[PDB]
Amino acid sequence: APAVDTAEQVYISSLALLKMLKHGRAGVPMEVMGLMLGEFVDDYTVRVIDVFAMPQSGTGVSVEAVDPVFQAKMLDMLKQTGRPEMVVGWYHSHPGFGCWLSGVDINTQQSFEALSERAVAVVVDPIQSVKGKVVIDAFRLINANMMVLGHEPRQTTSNLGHLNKPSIQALIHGLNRHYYSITINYRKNELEQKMLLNLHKKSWMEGLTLQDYSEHCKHNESVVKEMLELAKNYNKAVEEEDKMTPEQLAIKNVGKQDPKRHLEEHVDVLMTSNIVQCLAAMLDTVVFK
Amino acid sequence: MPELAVQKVVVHPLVLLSVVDHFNRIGKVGNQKRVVGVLLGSWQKKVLDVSNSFAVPFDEDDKDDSVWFLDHDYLENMYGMFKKVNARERIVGWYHTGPKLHKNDIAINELMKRYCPNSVLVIIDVKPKDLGLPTEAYISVEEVHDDGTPTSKTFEHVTSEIGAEEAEEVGVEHLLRDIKDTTVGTLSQRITNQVHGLKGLNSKLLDIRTYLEKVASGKLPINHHIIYQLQDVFNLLPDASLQEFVKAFYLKTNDQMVVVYLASLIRSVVALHNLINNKIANRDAEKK
Amino acid sequence: PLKMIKILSGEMAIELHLQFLIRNNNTDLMILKNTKDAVRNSVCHTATVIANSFMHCGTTSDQFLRDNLEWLARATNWAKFTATASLGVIHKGHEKEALQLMATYLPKDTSPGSAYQEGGGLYALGLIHANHGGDIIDYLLNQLKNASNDIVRHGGSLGLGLAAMGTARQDVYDLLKTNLYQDDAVTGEAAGLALGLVMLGSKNTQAIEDMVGYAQETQHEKIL
């Protein structure tokens, strides 16, 4: 109804976000799905705390996967731990479909909606988790009566109201005919950060370590030889270069970047090896002694 | 039961975050009463990948460390569900939330071994231990010491490091609102690491000395390995030699300085005379 | 120095503000019709009802009331609440109209006529009355306290906070405080925002202790 259905800007925690990406990834092209545990506050704030997953299959998302038995079973575990969580919504991964909600995915979302009125539907892209950009969206179903009278901008009110375009093609077309997409925010905590930042005890000595002379010598030999080749270029280059604009000087002296800059780059690489070795050389001897 | 399929234990950032988050969820216990939970992860590999952890409600008293509650029933039922998630997820061992191990931990370990095929007790700490590892991994071993101690069941350390998975690693960057001044990829990062290194060494170094004192008086049982390793460190000592840097960095930099200055010298007369005519023009131009 | 007492109280000040605005006013029917045709009930509408009310502000005009009777009727949801609320921004000053026009919307007349409108009136009222508040505040406390649903309670708490602004006194704070303690779904954001409004420009030891202590405890977004 336009008079009580608003979109749910989802605050997704580290425990949920990581879980969903990993589960989809291993299964591929077998698709994984599940229920999401979280808490609901406001009339629009859902924090997704944690997730567990439903049965994978080789046809992926289906009606058969969704049974009340799995959910009911989980809830008994929730009591025993003394965790309170109600069900916020459900998730799935589509490697085998785009962000558009497949015909079986809508069926599955309708059942889940009967149980929790406020229900969210999430596409995960496990494939994209391999690369350094990850695109995932959360959505909420829109009612048929709502469209005619209300129109889809009614979900946008009293919340963040960002509406996503996940390129063109099937994904966008399917979005428009089916659901309203709403944004993702990340929940964070200071403690949560601190865990992530932590490295190793071993790195403490790693820097200290006295870099072998042998290895250093390899680097030193490598640096002087490139320098000699470039040195010539440098020598011809300085006869001209009465004008500013360094890129023009790069075409003239030949190649991308000035030969003065090439020589410095090499001097600097050697400098970095040298810095660890010499600092380390005195430092080590004195401290253990 | 076997504790075999481990030579290394890598632990995900997920594991730590799950324990602090789960503390609030259960009861808001907060290490008032230490918690043991299942440690989940991969199998059929030499290396142990601890993919995941979930809490089990375990309260151990602070009157007494021999009394605890450990909820067994949860473990069997959670077992069937793990396959729904993925078929690489099985119970590897258990986690202790710290601050430290006990003698009591041997007894907690015998119960958990029935479920697992490769039980290990990995202490994941609710507080991060320093800037180092917030995790230490240990394995139950039957050993004698030539301290005049017959057969004991104790925990000897196995090397711990932090690993990650392709899906998980990306997700971590997005979540992070830190930028990393401790990345350790380059010279800028590398100099920070050296300052910290010295501080790290000092923190570790103190412990070694107190351990030696305890054996001397304030009687503590000698772990023979530790003493054997200590003596090795002092014998390798030599004295330092050479290493230095050239005048070359400067030469290049000076080259850049000449070029601009020559361009400047021709431009100067032109630019400086013109300024007065443009200046006057500007003030009038501005008004409209 | 007798009229000097009046102006300081705020009675006079409202008279001034309303007169300047009403008389000089410019208000064009076309904006309202263009908008009316484009969007029937939408989020776009929500921004409009408040915004078009602002454009022609400080006037007593019937023109809005007649023309966007139809807007109020079309609306449901959060859009309806803004539309009622926005009547206060038009009638800025207008002392006599402020209390009467809003009265119907307030819980002492209609109340199960639509909860959205019912809260909206309380919120419109605080808006007109702000920073001339002295008489108004008692009436606003009684109303908020009485009705106490979900919707009306949020509009009440935000409304009371605006009228009372800068009193820095426990009486408005205590009523509001009690609303903050329930941790009810919608009211929580208004009650927290409200505490700061009333306290403004001065401090009280009890005020600061509540706001900081409850922030740490809760993990519900609206109170925080």
Helix, strand, coil shares, percent, chain A, to 5 = 50, 15, 35
Residues C42, A151: C-beta atoms closer than 8 Å: yes
Closest CA to C154 of C114, C201, C194: C194
Q: Which chains touch C (3 or more CB pairs under 8 A)?
A: A
Q: Cα(B183)–Cα(B167) distance, rounded to whole angstroms?
A: 20
Distance from CA of B147 to the nearest CA of A (A): 29
Report the distance separating Cα A33 and Cα A23, nearest Å.
Answer: 9
Contact A191 B20 (CB under 8 A): yes
Distance CA B36, CA B39 (A): 9
CB contact under 8 A, A151 and C222: no
- Is residue A152 within 8 A of residue A142, CB to CB? The reply is yes
**Contact (CB<8Å) A260/B252:** yes
* CA diameter of chain C: 58
Length of chain A: 289
Cα–Cα distance for residue pair A157/A9, rounded to 1 Å = 12
Per DSSP, the residues of chain B read: ----S-S-EEE-HHHHHHHHHHHHHHT---SSS--EEEEEE--SSSSEEE-EEEE----B-SS-SS-B----HHHHHHHHHHHHH-TT-EEEEEEE--S---STHHHHHHHHHTT-SS--EEEE-SS--SSS-SEEEEEEEEEEETTTEEEEEEEEEE-EEE---HHHHHHHHHH-----S---SSHHHHHHHHHHHHHHHHHHHHHHHHHHHHHHSS-----HHHHHHHHHHHHT----------SHHHHHHHHHHHHHHHHHHHHHHHHHHHHHHHHHHHHHHHH-
Return the residue matching tokens 């010298």: B265
Give CA–CA dist A144/C3, Å, rounded: 63
The subunits that touch chain A, with at least 3 C-beta pairs less than 8 Å apart, are B, C
Report the run of H or E that residue A50 belongs to, with start and end.
Answer: strand A45-53
Cβ distance of B263 and A242 shorter than 8 Å? yes
Contacts of C46 in chain A (CB under 8 A): 157
Q: Are residues A161 and C43, on separate chains, in Cβ contact within 8 Å?
A: yes
Q: Which residues of A touch C186 (CB under 8 A)?
A: 42-43
Report yes or no: A56 at the B interface, CB cutoff 8 Å.
yes
Asked if A223 and A267 touch (Cβ cutoff 8 Å), the reply is yes
**End-to-end alpha carbon distance in chain C:** 49
* Distances in whole angstroms, Cα of residue B218 to Cα of each of B155, B211, B224, C206, C219: 22, 10, 18, 53, 48
DSSP annotation of A129 reads: G
User: What is the Cα–Cα distance from A237 to A226, expressed in whole angstroms?
Assistant: 17
Question: Cβ–Cβ contacts within 10 Å for residue C91, how many?
Answer: 27
Q: Tell how strand A33-41 and strand A86-93 pair up.
A: antiparallel
Cβ atoms B56, B75 nearer than 8 A:
yes
Encoded amino acid at A281, one letter = A
The alpha carbon of residue A172 is apart from the nearest alpha carbon of chain B, in Å, by 24
**CB neighbour class for B167 (10 Å; exposed up to 12, middle 13-18, buried from 19):** buried
Nearest Cα neighbor of A46 from C98, C185, C51, B132 is C185
Mutate to test the interface with A, among B255, B256, B257, B258 (most CBs of A within 10 A): B255
Angle of the C151-164 helix axis to the C170-182 helix axis, nearest 10: 160
CA distances for A104 relative to A64, A68, A111, B138, B210, angstroms: 10, 17, 11, 47, 65
Strand pairing report for A86-93 and A121-124: parallel
What CA–CA distance (Å, rounded) separates A106 from A110? Answer: 6
How many other CB atoms are there within 10 angstroms of residue B137's CB atom?
A: 25
In chain C, whose CA is at the least distance from the CA of A46? C221
Whether C87 and C93 have beta carbons less than 8 Å apart is answered as: no
What are the angstrom distances between the C-alpha of B192 and each of A160, B177, B186?
40, 20, 10
Residues 6+ apart with CB under 8 A from C168: C198, C199, C200, C201, C202, C203, C204, C207
CA distances from A224 to A266, A269, B28, B248 (A): 8, 11, 63, 11
Experimental method: cryo-EM
Whether A147 and chain C come into contact, CB under 8 Å, resolves to: no
Shortest Cα distance, chain A CAs vs residue B243, angstroms: 5
**Set of chain A residues whose Cβ sits within 8 Å of the Cβ of B171:** 14, 17-18, 21, 129, 134
Question: Which residues are B132's β-sheet partners?
Answer: none
Rounded Cα distance between C199 and C193, Å, is: 11
For A12, phi then psi, to 5°, come to: -105, 120
Min Cα distance B212 → chain A (Å) is 17
Q: Where are the alpha helices (DSSP H) in chain C?
A: 3-9, 11-24, 29-38, 43-55, 63-67, 69-74, 77-85, 87-90, 95-103, 115-129, 136-147, 151-164, 170-182, 187-199, 205-217
Q: Which residues of C215-224 are buried (b: 16+ CB within 10 A; e: fewer)?
A: eeebebbbbe
Report helix, strand or coil for C181: helix
- What is the rounded distance in angstroms from the CA atom of residue A144 to the CA atom of residue A163? 19
User: Residue A47: its chain C contacts at CB < 8 A?
Assistant: 219, 221
User: Chains A and C: how many Cβ contacts under 8 Å?
Assistant: 52
C80, closest residue in chain A (CA to CA): A3
Are B122 and B135 within 8 A, CB to CB?
yes
Token pair, residue A256, equals 């991308």
Q: Give which of A50, A53, A75, A76 is closest to A65, Cα–Cα.
A: A53
Which residues on A lie below 8 Å from B201 (Cβ)? 204-205, 208, 287
- Encoding tokens for residue C189? 């954001």
Retrieve residue A251's tokens.
């075409």
How many Cβ atoms from other residues are within 10 Å of residue C142's Cβ?
14
Strands across the sheet containing A137-141? A179-182, A137-141, A121-124, A86-93, A33-41, A45-53, A9-12, A184-186
Site of tokens 């004195």: A286
Amino acid at residue number A181: S
Amino acid (1-letter code) at residue B185: G
